[PDB]
Design a protein around this ligand. Structure first.
Ligand SMILES: O=C(NCc1nc(C2CC2)cs1)c1cc(CNCC2CC2)[nH]n1
Ligand SMILES: [Zn+2]
Ligand SMILES: [Zn+2]
Ligand SMILES: [Zn+2]
Length: 423
């Protein structure tokens, strides 16, 4: 983002009367008092760094500093020299396991930008004094720099980034634009409410209305183990449903790039294309199947049919992979960014929770007691060691997937008792 790019200033002219209409980022940054070519960034760079987004609003009358973490600080009610210490602590704790930077998302009216100099220092890109991550904070006590992990006691935010949502060409104020898409965040006339709304609207614009599944996001947690667990569980559960109930046809509704998850199964496999719905859940009436079984693997519909196998992401889950989203939805970032419509328990009324089970027909070849280890093994009274090992690996994956937020549902007649006679 060129510092010579033009910045529209109408939003700022109520806090800053007489501000020039003709303004560049270069001159704004100067007016604000200030590897790092611009404090501001493009919508594209911002999207690549969605994990760093912290909505931010400042409201005057002595100022109130609201952030999308729900926090409201008053700077005078306490002086700035303590308020900046709290800001560093809050952002470091919020972001250390998410991103290597902060990106302040704004609906800029002026106070938020003029307040920055009181808690931000800028300069050349640097590295942490105690590790190799880029520096995000600075301390004036020790003249040293630190990342989010090592910033305890540090008092200034260092080389923050920011983006003003009002530059994207909106009509009317923040609430009137946010409420067009979202009924979950209110307008309680505290600064944090605006900050939360600002981020929500930004997420809606970049991930609900606009979608880019080509953007990749760095590994920050159990991504790989989780995705592997999901493939393992998917194969297990679908294979067992075909054996227990012997459906003649399976209707695989969802990703157009889907491959048969149980390739050796007898059934007639029919695919139906539906991209991840990022806004509202698909209506099963538009999508549509009563023959056999329907596989909705992360295909969010509003009411699943009774003859389904379903894996559905639970947006309420607290994890580093799952960011708060728009209108109760969540932004699940695991390699790619998937805004997900809000979890709705009623979608599953025709189904039941799927119980844990492990099923294997593999030879017993290389002490576990479990009623859910479904193997010739246990049928004959004593689980062999190989199936004990596999059982404990599968449980681990299964638990990994559930705790990552996924939930599993199945048709009501599913009964693992029917699998024992496949031995
Ligand atoms: O009164 C708001 N904060 C509370 C505040 N305490 C202070 C003093 C330090 C104690 C200053 S301000 C507030 C007002 C809004 C309005 N946002 C939407 C605009 C109206 C279209 N947001 N927060
Ligand atoms: Zn560090
Ligand atoms: Zn919202
Ligand atoms: Zn065995």
């Amino acid at each position: 983002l060129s510092v010579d790019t033009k910045f529209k200033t109408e939003g700022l002219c109520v806090d800053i009367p007489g501000i020039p209409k003709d303004m560049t980022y270069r001159r704004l940054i100067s007016m604000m008092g200030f590897g790092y070519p611009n404090m501001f960034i493009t919508r594209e760079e911002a999207i690549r760094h969605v994990r760093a987004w912290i909505g931010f609003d400042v409201e005057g009358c002595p100022l109130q500093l609201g952030f999308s973490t729900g926090v409201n600080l008053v700077a005078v009610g306490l002086p700035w020299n303590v308020v900046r210490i709290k800001i560093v602590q809050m952002l470091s704790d919020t972001l250390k396991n998410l991103s290597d930077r902060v990106v302040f998302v704004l609906w800029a009216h002026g106070f938020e930008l003029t307040s920055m100099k009181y808690f931000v220092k800028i300069g050349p890109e640097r590295t942490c004094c105690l590790c190799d991550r880029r520096a995000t904070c600075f301390s004036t006590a020790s003249d040293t720099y630190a990342c989010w992990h090592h910033s305890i006691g540090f008092d200034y935010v260092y080389n923050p980034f920011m983006i003003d949502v009002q530059q994207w060409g909106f009509t009317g104020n923040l609430q009137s634009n946010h409420d067009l898409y979202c009924q979950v965040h209110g307008n309680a006339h505290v600064a944090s409410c605006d900050a939360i709304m600002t981020r929500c609207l930004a997420v809606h614009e970049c991930f609900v209305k606009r979608v880019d599944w080509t953007i990749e996001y760095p590994i920050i947690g159990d991504e790989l183990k989780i995705n592997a667990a999901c493939r393992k569980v998917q194969h297990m559960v679908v294979k067992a449903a075909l054996l227990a109930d012997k459906f003649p046809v399976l209707h695989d509704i969802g990703n157009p790039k889907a491959i048969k998850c149980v390739p050796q199964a007898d059934v007639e496999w029919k695919f139906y294309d539906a991209q991840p719905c990022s806004d509202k859940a698909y209506k099963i009436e538009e999508l549509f199947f009563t023959d056999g079984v329907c596989l909705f693997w992360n295909c969010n519909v509003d009411r699943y049919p009774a003859n389904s196998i379903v894996c559905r992401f639970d947006t309420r889950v607290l994890s580093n992979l799952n960011l708060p989203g728009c209108d109760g939805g969540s932004l699940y970032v695991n390699k790619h960014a998937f805004h997900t419509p809000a979890f709705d328990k009623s979608a599953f009324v025709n189904l039941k929770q799927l119980p844990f089970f492990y099923y294997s027909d593999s030879p017993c070849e290389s002490p576990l007691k479990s009623a859910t280890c479904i193997t010739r093994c246990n049928l004959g009274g004593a689980v062999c060691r190989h199936h004990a090992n596999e059982y404990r690996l599968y449980l681990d994956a299964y638990n990994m997937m559930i705790s990552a937020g996924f939930s599993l549902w199945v048709y009501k007649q599913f009964d693992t008792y029917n699998l024992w006679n496949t031995f």
